[PDB]
Swiss-Prot record, chain B:
Signal peptide: none annotated. Belongs to the Fanconi anemia group I protein family. The chain holds residues 209 to 553 of 1338 of the full protein. This is Fanconi anemia group I protein. There is a cross-link at residue 283 (Glycyl lysine isopeptide (Lys-Gly) (interchain with G-Cter in ubiquitin)). It comes from the Eukaryota. Monoubiquitinated by FANCL during S phase and upon genotoxic stress. Deubiquitinated by USP1 as cells enter G2/M, or once DNA repair is completed. Monoubiquitination requires the FANCA-FANCB-FANCC-FANCE-FANCF-FANCG-FANCM complex. Ubiquitination is required for binding to chromatin, DNA repair, and normal cell cycle progression. Monoubiquitination is stimulated by DNA-binding. Phosphorylated in response to DNA damage by ATM and/or ATR. Phosphorylation of FANCI promotes ubiquitination of FANCD2, which prevents DNA release from the FANCI-FANCD2 complex. Plays an essential role in the repair of DNA double-strand breaks by homologous recombination and in the repair of interstrand DNA cross-links (ICLs) by promoting FANCD2 monoubiquitination by FANCL and participating in recruitment to DNA repair sites. The FANCI-FANCD2 complex binds and scans double-stranded DNA (dsDNA) for DNA damage; this complex stalls at DNA junctions between double-stranded DNA and single-stranded DNA. Participates in S phase and G2 phase checkpoint activation upon DNA damage. Homodimer. Part of a FANCI-FANCD2 heterodimeric complex that binds and scans dsDNA for DNA damage. Interacts with FANCL. Interacts with MTMR15/FAN1. Interacts with POLN. Interacts with UBL5; the interaction promotes FANCI homodimerization. It comes from Gallus gallus (Chicken). The gene is FANCI.
From Swiss-Prot, chain D:
Belongs to the Fanconi anemia protein FANCD2 family. It comes from the Eukaryota. Homodimer; cannot be ubiquitinated and does not bind DNA. Part of a FANCI-FANCD2 heterodimeric complex that binds and scans dsDNA for DNA damage. Interacts directly with FANCE and FANCI. Interacts with USP1 and MEN1. The ubiquitinated form specifically interacts with BRCA1 and BLM. Both the nonubiquitinated and the monoubiquitinated forms interact with BRCA2; this interaction is mediated by phosphorylated FANCG and the complex also includes XCCR3. The ubiquitinated form specifically interacts with MTMR15/FAN1 (via UBZ-type zinc finger), leading to recruit MTMR15/FAN1 to sites of DNA damage. Transmembrane segments: none annotated. This is Fanconi anemia group D2 protein. Deubiquitinated by USP1 as cells enter G2/M, or once DNA repair is completed. Monoubiquitination prevents DNA release from the FANCI-FANCD2 complex. FANCD2 is only ubiquitinated in the FANCI-FANCD2 complex and the monoubiquitination of FANCD2 is promoted by phosphorylation of FANCI. Required for maintenance of chromosomal stability. Promotes accurate and efficient pairing of homologs during meiosis. Involved in the repair of DNA double-strand breaks, both by homologous recombination and single-strand annealing. The FANCI-FANCD2 complex binds and scans double-stranded DNA (dsDNA) for DNA damage; this complex stalls at DNA junctions between double-stranded DNA and single-stranded DNA. May participate in S phase and G2 phase checkpoint activation upon DNA damage. It is found in: Nucleus.
Length: 307, 311, 206, 168
DNA sequence: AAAAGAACGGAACGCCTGCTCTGAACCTGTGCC
């Protein structure tokens, strides 16, 4: 039945936007998701359906809002019970990075259009909210095993550091880009606060137990995440100031919310840091050479500008 | 042979130490049950030894206090392990002792909630199953406990019925799984524990009309299952067919329809129940208000098909 | 009789408020065998969330007068009548000194509400509900023990573990009052629970 | 000296917290009588944190971390809700007061950096909350300026990390 | 010397908002009516 439905969708999707009927296309995607719930868990058609949809997603461009969101929701439901999607999220992060300009404002990127589903017009939370939702789920299940982790434990630690390490590269890609100023900026800082906390309980567990693999994760964590994150914080100042100009031309409420995650981002950095300090002395290893001193910012009231 | 020897060993533990001897005898029973699974005399020996140990623990309740800490530590270490039929049987037996049973019940509830949450997590993500294959199911062992203790045990039936009574209220997703588990264990013990059938029926009838404001759909479901399993149980539980109509016309949320359908064989084999419901019908239908008169007419309409139309 | 008849029926919504107000006005005038009749008739009829003030006023009016367990049956008829009563009494007892019917209905809600100790643990731990009032209630209102036996097991047992000295004092007073009951089975159960607490429990509890 | 210093900050913070909160412009010229108090309090805090510079004792650093965090939290909780309304009539006073407070809070970042540089367990026990509170103050100042339509003037900038009475 | 003690250091469940996605006939503009 899916085959009879795939033909209609690809014919509709390949057709010109004049004959689009996006309402049917959204239904054409939801029926796929609702009919993909009861496939054979180890069936070949499970893999075959995945091979087709990633081809369509990476080739076609579902310019419609829900069509892109709906199709992307489907592919993850199959790509959860079978594998981990951090490779896809990393790949998508490249396209949005290629879609816009970097935070540094002095570096350019090639087209690198690995997925055609995402494009310049889809830079909105259309995609960068869903993947962060998976980032929420990916870390949500990680806490469960870490809590259990608190003979095969060597395999347990190796797998987590692979997913977290790959995901750490992902966050590095987004954090260098100019994210849309909507709640996606907020949600990125909400998961960024969450991510550092999960970094702790594994280390907090191992206190009661040295490996260089853990150090290499920390070395990558310091190099590709922290200075970019703080620089990304400096980016937010420019974005909010420009965005706050749209004040119809009592902004107390908006200003507080627009910078609420920022302080707690710092705190989640140092609570991990304070216990990572604790580990270094108890672990007899100097882990701070890779990392950098925790930077901070001051302000200044422009008296002349008040005139 | 073994019962007196382990009784002497328990006396020695009372004189000596109990940290490891308890776990050792649990392990011995565990491998005995494993080797006997693939044994009625052995089961009678098991009943005798559990009776001896539960009597000893009831005499000295504080001696068994270390069991709680030991099992909590094991559960923290072992992910779902150590909840063998022997351990849970010992836990339920001392619950009937009425000493600190509330904390043991709370620990059991936390354990089963964690177990069903973990089962859902593993089912909803295979990536955790590959790295965490230690899928331990408390439901499987507790349901096997019904068959394990179905050989005339001293207090296994009482422990199981108390466990189910706590479970059904704990259910109030994880709540649905808890309700399903409680209903299944109650059905199993009703189909197994013959001499507690009347007591179980009376207790659930007392509980069935126990949550007027709160939903009791699970109650009516379990009552219907036990009645359809044993149609004449409530017949031996007489003087309650008339009693069950105390406040039936207060909160019809389909509860009245389910109750009527569950008890329908009793009405068609019990003329006194039919007469009493006829008497209640005059009061129900003549209620000037309309807040609850819908339940009366719905029940009467169902009854019209309840009685046969032979002739 | 007219109050019972009208409560047996359902009138217009607007006219419900005025007849309800007439009901609480006539509540104090109801005699010992007559006031409970109107009390249950209006308690069954009243099902309004705005009736929290009505419940507070009824508690204030019936405090002086305090089978007579029929009011407990009327409150039991409503399965989930806890919220309005507990909010009304929390608002009231935060200012009012105390009330015997307040404690009685709080106990009734615990064994229906399964959630009533929260104000109890709060007001007792914060300068309210003197043990003398509870002792006088137990001595006079014998229906409290006649209401149900696990009241002592529901309240005093948890009161022993309380950290506040007022909490444990109240628990000890409740246990002492419960020992004074004439129920031989209830007294034996209470004494067995007491010796269980003495044998096993916190050293202060022992 | 350290016990002197600890009790001095304790009493200073208790007095600061004892100040009335910020009414929504419910007073005319009473705010004037409730403004210079914060000026002298910030001056006292500046004097104490300068006293830190001489005595590098570990307990001194610990108590200063803890009670500077507590004081800045109290400032955020109480003063600024009052300070936003006083900004209308009073401009130079609040600006100078903010200058003094910012001068005071500058050294807390440096000494937190020193704490994490020296791996002082007792000292690293208090760094995260202090850093979060300082960030909260930085952003509350912007909030108040934007509330009084002075959002153009405000500007954030990275603070050059330094050791105690040093650089880098 | 860098060990305790217990007073110092610290954690969990509960709350309804000030939130942003969603909503709705409109009123405008312009090829059509």
């Amino acid at each position: 039945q899916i085959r009879q439905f795939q033909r209609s969708l690809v014919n509709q999707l390949s057709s010109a936007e004049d004959d689009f009927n996006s309402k049917e296309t959204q239904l054409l995607i939801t029926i796929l998701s609702t009919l993909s719930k009861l496939l054979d868990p180890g069936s070949q058609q499970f893999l075959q359906f995945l091979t087709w949809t990633v081809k369509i997603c990476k080739e076609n461009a579902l310019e419609d809002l829900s069509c892109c969101k709906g199709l992307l929701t489907l592919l993850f439901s199959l790509h959860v019970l079978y594998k981990s999607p951090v490779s896809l999220l990393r790949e998508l992060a490249q396209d949005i990075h290629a879609c816009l300009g970097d935070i540094d404002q002095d570096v350019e990127i090639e087209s690198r259009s690995h997925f055609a589903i995402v494009n310049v017009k889809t830079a909105a939370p259309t995609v960068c909210l869903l993947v962060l939702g998976q980032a929420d789920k990916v870390l949500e299940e990680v806490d469960w095993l870490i809590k259990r982790l608190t003979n095969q434990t060597q395999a347990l630690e190796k797998g987590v550091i692979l997913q977290l390490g790959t995901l750490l590269t992902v966050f590095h890609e987004l954090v260098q880009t100019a994210l849309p100023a909507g709640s996606c900026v907020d949600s990125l800082l909400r998961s960024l606060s969450k991510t550092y906390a999960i970094l702790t309980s594994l280390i907090k567990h191992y206190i009661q137990a040295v490996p260089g693999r853990l150090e290499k994760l920390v070395k990558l964590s310091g190099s590709h995440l922290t200075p970019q994150c703080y620089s990304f914080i400096t980016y937010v100042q420019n974005i909010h100031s420009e965005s706050l100009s749209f004040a119809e031309e009592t902004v107390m409420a908006k200003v507080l919310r627009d910078t609420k995650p920022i302080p707690n981002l710092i705190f989640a950095i140092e609570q991990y840091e304070k216990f990572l300090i604790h580990l270094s002395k108890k672990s007899k290893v100097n882990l701070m050479q890779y990392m950098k001193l925790s930077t901070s910012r001051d302000f200044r009231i422009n008296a002349s500008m008040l005139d | 042979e073994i019962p007196p020897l382990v009784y002497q060993l328990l006396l020695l533990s009372a004189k000596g130490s109990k940290k490891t001897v308890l776990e050792g005898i649990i392990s011995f029973f565990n491998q005995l049950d494993k080797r006997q699974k693939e044994l009625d005399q052995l089961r009678h020996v098991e009943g005798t030894v559990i009776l001896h140990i539960v009597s000893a623990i009831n005499l000295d309740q504080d001696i068994g206090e270390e069991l709680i800490k030991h099992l909590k530590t094991e559960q923290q270490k072992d992910p779902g392990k150590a909840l063998c039929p022997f351990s849970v049987s010992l836990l339920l037996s001392t619950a009937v002792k009425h000493r600190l049973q509330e904390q043991i019940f709370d620990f059991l509830k936390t354990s089963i909630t964690r177990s069903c949450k973990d089962l859902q997590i593993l089912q909803a993500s295979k990536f955790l199953q590959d790295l965490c294959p230690q899928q331990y199911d408390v439901t499987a062992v507790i349901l096997e406990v019904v068959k394990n203790s179905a050989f005339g045990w001293d207090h296994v039936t009482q422990g199981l019925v108390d466990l189910g009574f706590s479970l059904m209220e704990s259910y109030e997703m994880p709540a649905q799984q808890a309700c399903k588990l409680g209903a299944s264990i109650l059905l199993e013990t009703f189909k197994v524990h013959e001499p507690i059938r009347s007591d179980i029926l009376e207790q659930v009838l007392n509980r069935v009309l126990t949550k007027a404001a709160s939903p009791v759909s699970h109650f009516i479901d379990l009552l219907s299952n036990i009645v359809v399993s044993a149609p004449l149980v409530l017949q031996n539980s007489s003087s309650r067919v008339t009693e069950t109509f105390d406040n039936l016309s207060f909160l019809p949320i389909d509860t009245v329809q389910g109750l009527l359908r569950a008890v329908q064989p009793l009405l068609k084999v019990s003329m006194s129940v039919r007469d009493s419901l006829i008497l209640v019908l005059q009061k129900a239908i003549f209620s000037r208000q309309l807040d609850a008169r819908k339940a009366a007419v719905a029940g009467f309409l169902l009854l019209l098909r309840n009685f046969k139309i032979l002739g | 009789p007219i109050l019972d008849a009208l409560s047996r029926l359902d009138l217009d919504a607007e006219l419900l408020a005025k007849v309800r107000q007439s009901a609480m006005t006539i509540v104090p005038s109801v005699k010992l065998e007559d006031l409970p009749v109107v009390i249950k008739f209006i308690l069954h009829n009243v099902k309004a969330a705005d009736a929290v003030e009505v419940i507070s006023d009824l508690r204030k009016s019936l405090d002086l007068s305090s089978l007579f367990d029929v009011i407990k049956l009327a409150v039991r008829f409503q399965k989930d009548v806890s919220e309005a009563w507990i909010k009304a009494i929390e608002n009231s007892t935060s200012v009012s000194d105390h009330k015997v019917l307040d404690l009685i209905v709080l106990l009734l809600i615990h064994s229906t509400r399964k959630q009533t100790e929260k104000v109890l643990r709060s007001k007792i731990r914060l300068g309210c509900m003197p043990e003398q009032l509870m002792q006088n209630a137990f001595q006079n209102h014998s229906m409290v023990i006649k209401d149900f036996f696990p009241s002592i097991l529901s309240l005093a047992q948890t009161f022993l573990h309380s950290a506040h000295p007022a909490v444990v004092s109240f628990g000890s007073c409740m246990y002492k009052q419960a020992f004074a009951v004439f129920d031989s089975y209830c007294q034996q159960e209470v004494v067995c629970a007491l010796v269980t607490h003495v044998c096993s429990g916190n050293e202060t509890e022992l | 000296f350290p016990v002197f210093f600890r009790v001095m900050m304790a009493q200073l913070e208790s007095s600061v917290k004892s100040i009335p909160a910020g009414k929504p412009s419910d007073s005319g010229e009473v705010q004037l009588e409730k403004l210079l108090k914060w000026n002298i309090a910030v001056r006292n805090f500046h004097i104490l944190i300068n006293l830190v510079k001489v005595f590098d004792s570990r307990p001194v650093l610990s108590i200063c971390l803890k009670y500077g965090r507590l004081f800045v939290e109290a400032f955020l909780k109480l003063a600024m809700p009052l300070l936003d309304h006083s900004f209308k009539k009073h401009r130079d006073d609040v600006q100078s007061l903010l200058k003094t407070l910012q001068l005071s809070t500058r050294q807390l970042h440096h000494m937190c950096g020193h704490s994490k540089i020296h791996q002082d367990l007792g000292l690293t026990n208090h760094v995260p909350l202090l850093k979060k509170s300082l960030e909260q103050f930085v952003y509350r100042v912007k909030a108040m300026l934007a509330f009084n339509h002075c959002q153009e003037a405000f500007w954030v900038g990275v603070l050059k990390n330094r050791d105690l009475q040093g650089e880098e």
